[PDB]
Amino acid sequence: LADLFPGFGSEWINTSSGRIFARVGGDGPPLLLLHGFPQTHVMWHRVAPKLAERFKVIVADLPGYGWSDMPESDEQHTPYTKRAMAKQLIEAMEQLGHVHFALAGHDRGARVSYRLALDSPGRLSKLAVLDILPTYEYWQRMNRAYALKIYHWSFLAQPAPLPENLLGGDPDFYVKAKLASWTRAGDLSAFDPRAVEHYRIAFADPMRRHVMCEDYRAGAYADFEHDKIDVEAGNKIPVPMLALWGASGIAQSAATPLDVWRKWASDVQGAPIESGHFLPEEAPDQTAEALVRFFSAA
Amino acid sequence: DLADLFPGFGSEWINTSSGRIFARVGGDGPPLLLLHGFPQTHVMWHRVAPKLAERFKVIVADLPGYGWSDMPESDEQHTPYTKRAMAKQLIEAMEQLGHVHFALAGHDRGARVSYRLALDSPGRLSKLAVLDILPTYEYWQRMNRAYALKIYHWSFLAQPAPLPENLLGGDPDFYVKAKLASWTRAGDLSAFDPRAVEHYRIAFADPMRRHVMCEDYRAGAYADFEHDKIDVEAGNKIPVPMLALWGASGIAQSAATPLDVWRKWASDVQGAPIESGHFLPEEAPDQTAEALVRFFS
């Protein structure tokens, strides 16, 4: 596998729930980046160098993803709920001495991010989410048109081992299908071919695939229940927040993103990016520019 | 290798302008057509068909593209596997037997063909019975988190080719067996005759047959929904006397009250729950046969 982060170090951060792998580089105030599905930390490889000029950038594999350890799930899918993932990543940042940091997440990592901001707002200086709406909002808007578009939210959440058996017949096909279908061009041209190999090799492991299904099972149940408690109680994110989305991405097909996040965050600014779902790879220059200005602002 | 579960029944290859329709024919009296659904074939009626053949001429047909019936070539709109097209093709088949006015009972996908047939050509039916379904328009209109998780296969199988086709090939024996067991009351295959389970499994092993099933659900997500929509907006109802049966732990009542919903679609409908899961004629064959025999006679 290619090293897509030249100059960055490599670290294995031990937590009570398992080791967190991360690439480390830059200097300045600490900034944590989190990837999504079906990717790994290498999805940031074209914006992390630009961020590395001003911040100490930590690019971590989500718990259960990439090279991080895989905790054993349970009937509640507890280790792969976003609330448990947030606590483990907080533990990892304390191992590095970072108890107050900035955080940017994409796809599943952005879900860990806003849950982290709700459960423990004192840990974040600023927060940025990429091309998502809250899990609660995806499910409340689950009509016919949206069920067809994000079918995998319902399919991957089916009980074990039905989705795992189906994905095992040709796993290369499914990861390449999901990567291509969410870009604007509809193919794999926006991705560095060395980064695709990282995604393909990670998806080839059946234990990694089961972990991703546990992630989506938590997103259909416990993650939804946690978000439901927060909306019906009127709990908003008090951390200053940036919401970026692709003009052809997933979040915009559901609603108007800034209007929804205003209901969830007291201090939120937003902007679209001419791209599909994978902002830092389809539009690296504009995403990095939007992130640098926001985090270095006040 | 396949057991014959219809002793005393003939076997007919009925020609239509879109392909042959296979059917087991038995009994005597007025004609009655029985249509199966997903993921089964005609043999699902094998425990209730002999009792109906005591009073009717019973035609147990494979749906177009299903089981041993021919597979018409599909197109961009999945035209031949829309319920309107399937209904027209089956009207053709019955005309080949000289049946222009008959009784009809459908289950699952065949029940969707049935009520679409009653909406398009009501003069062709004397009575109509649907098993454990609501109209396709009602499933999509009620789509929420709970229903999207339960009938996930409506959105999954409706994805563009070849995504469901390739994933179904990853383990087809497991999938067809997981659908049969998870929709029963017992949660396993213990309610099915093992020889019937074979019929379903060897049919699901043909990749061309699995493609037809995805085309069925692709039509169910689009064209079938559009046709139900025109009837709903126009206030069109089913004028044929109708029987609606559903399972106490079936698909239809988990997200509605079935007889309440069907009254908005039909001007004369009676209903009854059955102590069963989804597969009424195999999980509770005596109760299903009793209600059908009474309703049709």
Curated annotation (Swiss-Prot), chain B:
Protein name in the entry: Fluoroacetate dehalogenase
Entry similarity comment: Belongs to the AB hydrolase superfamily. Epoxide hydrolase family.
TM annotation in the entry: none
Binding-site residues, fluoroacetate: 109, 112, 153-154, 217
Effect of residue 278 to N: Abolishes hydrolysis of covalent reaction intermediate
Subunit description: Homodimer.
Effect caused by changing residue 153 to N: Reduced catalytic rate with fluoroacetate, but increased catalytic rate with chloroacetate. Minor effect on substrate affinity
Domain AB hydrolase-1: 30-268
